[PDB]
A paper describes a structure:
Human endonuclease VIII-like 1 (hNEIL1) is a bifunctional DNA glycosylase of the Fpg/Nei family, which catalyzes the removal of damaged bases and subsequent incision of the newly generated abasic sites. Unlike traditional enzymes which are commonly referred to as highly specific biocatalysts, one special feature for hNEIL1 is its unique capability to recognize a wide range of substrates, including formamidopyrimidines, hydantoin lesions, oxidized, and dihydro-modified pyrimidine bases, derived from all four canonical bases. Here, by integrating structural, computational, and biochemical investigations, we show that hNEIL1 uses a triage mechanism to achieve broad specificity and reduce futile repair of normal bases. This mechanism involves two mutually competing interaction states: an activated state that commits catalysis and BER, and a quarantine state that temporarily separates and prevents the flipped base from catalysis via auto-inhibition.
For a naturally existing hNEIL1 variant (R242)14 in complex with dsDNAs containing OHU, Sp1, or Gh, the damaged bases are in close contact with the guanidine group of R242. Such conformation of the lesion recognition loop resembles that in the hNEIL1-Tg structure, where the positively charged side chain of residue 242 is contiguous to the solvent-exposed flipped base while the aromatic residue Y244 is laid away from the active site (thus called “242-in” conformation). Noteworthy, across all these structures, we observed an unusually short distance (~3.0 Å) between an outwards heterocyclic nitrogen atom of the nucleobases and the terminal nitrogen atom of residue 242. While repulsion is expected for the two groups if both are fully protonated (i.e., an −NH group in the nucleobase and a positively charged side chain of residue 242), we previously showed in the hNEIL1–Tg complex that hNEIL1 utilizes a tautomerization-dependent mechanism to recognize the flipped base. In this mechanism, the base undergoes a keto-enol tautomerization event where the originally protonated heterocyclic nitrogen atom becomes a hydrogen bond acceptor and hence can be hydrogen-bonded to residue 242. The fact that different recognition states were crystallographically captured for the same edited hNEIL1(R242) variant bound to different base lesions suggests that the flipped nucleobase per se also contributes to the stability of the interaction states. hNEIL1 repairs a diverse array of base damage, whose aromaticity and hydrophilicity differ greatly. Oxidized substrates of hNEIL1 are often bulky and contain non-planar structures; this disrupted aromaticity is expected to diminish the π–π stacking with Tyr244 and hence destabilize the quarantine state. Moreover, it is expected that the bases with less solvent interactions (e.g. DHU) would favor the formation of a stable quarantine state compared with the hydrophilic bases (Sp1, 5-OHU, Gh, and Tg).
Numbering used by the authors: 2 to 202, 223 to 244, 249 to 290
The structure:
DNA sequence: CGTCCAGTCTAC
DNA sequence: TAGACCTGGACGG
């Protein structure tokens, strides 16, 4: 997922878990190479926040819960195929790698981290990844300043389409968002990043916020196949007929219209 | 059947 | 930088 999907997943966890109470341990599938979550409580609540391409779960025991346990935080990266589902406890999806089980009273549910390809990761810390820049959705002013104050960095020597995937400066931007952002300003994707940005100190850094915010305001992204059609209708550039495509230097497809730009392969 | 396609992470 | 990490759906023979 990209920023909008991480944000919608966190909203899903908060709304779906608002009136739920979890109990017992945190179950990992046997094939996941991610760490076991050392947590048990008779009664805990689950809440979430997103920052960029990361999601933080907080496991919060209720007053009196046993064993003695302090709130525990988990940070998830989704990779290519990560998501959260709330499912009936005996109808786990195929790739449910981490599960939180509702306590009784009511229907036994499992909140699941589901990840087909297992490119997703989680850490016990609760800390955001060091080196990831601020969230383009929730920390816009910090994100904007962190870019404009470090244009000398060699990251900005690269084509703008490659720079937009660098999570130290554009935390939350992925493949579809870089195409949609550049399409709206008709910036050639192989323009030098430093050239497009030096001329800024509604612009490119503004769209790094407002474009992904549009995806959030659609809602959906899992969180029927109606909001999947809603998304495909919103896309103007990524994968669309009449658009060009090239491989960047890491073999990721950039969709665009017209001029490929000077640093084109 | 087969090939090809859809975000980090790390060994060179 | 190139390869690794993985599964499944769309498509071709």
């Amino acid at each position: 997922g990209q920023g909008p999907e991480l944000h919608l997943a966190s909203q899903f966890v908060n709304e779906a878990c608002r009136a739920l109470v979890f109990g017992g341990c945190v179950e990992k599938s046997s094939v996941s190479r991610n760490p076991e979550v050392p947590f048990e409580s008779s009664a805990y609540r689950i809440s979430a926040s997103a920052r960029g391409k990361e999601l933080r779960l907080i496991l919060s025991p209720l007053p009196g819960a046993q064993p003695q346990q302090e709130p525990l935080a988990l940070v998830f990266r989704f990779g290519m195929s990560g998501s959260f589902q709330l499912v009936p406890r005996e109808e786990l999806p195929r790739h449910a790698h981490l599960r939180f089980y509702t306590a009784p009273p009511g229907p036994r549910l499992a909140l699941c981290f589901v990840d087909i390809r297992r490119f997703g990761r989680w850490d016990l810390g609760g800390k955001w990844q060091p080196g990831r820049g601020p969230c383009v959705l929730q920390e816009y002013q910090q994100f904007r300043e962190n870019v404009l104050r470090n244009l000398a960095d060699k990251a900005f020597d690269r084509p703008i389409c490659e720079a937009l995937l660098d999570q130290r400066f554009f935390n939350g931007i992925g493949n579809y968002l870089r195409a949609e952002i550049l399409y709206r300003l008709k910036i050639p994707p192989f323009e030098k990043a430093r050239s497009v940005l030096e001329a800024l100190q509604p612009d490119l850094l503004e769209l790094c916020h407002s474009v992904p915010k549009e995806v959030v305001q659609l809602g959906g992204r899992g969180y029927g196949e109606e909001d999947f059609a809603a998304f495909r209708a919103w896309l103007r550039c990524y994968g669309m007929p009449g658009m060009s495509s090239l491989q960047d230097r890491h073999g990721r497809t950039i969709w665009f219209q017209g001029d490929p730009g000077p640093l084109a392969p």
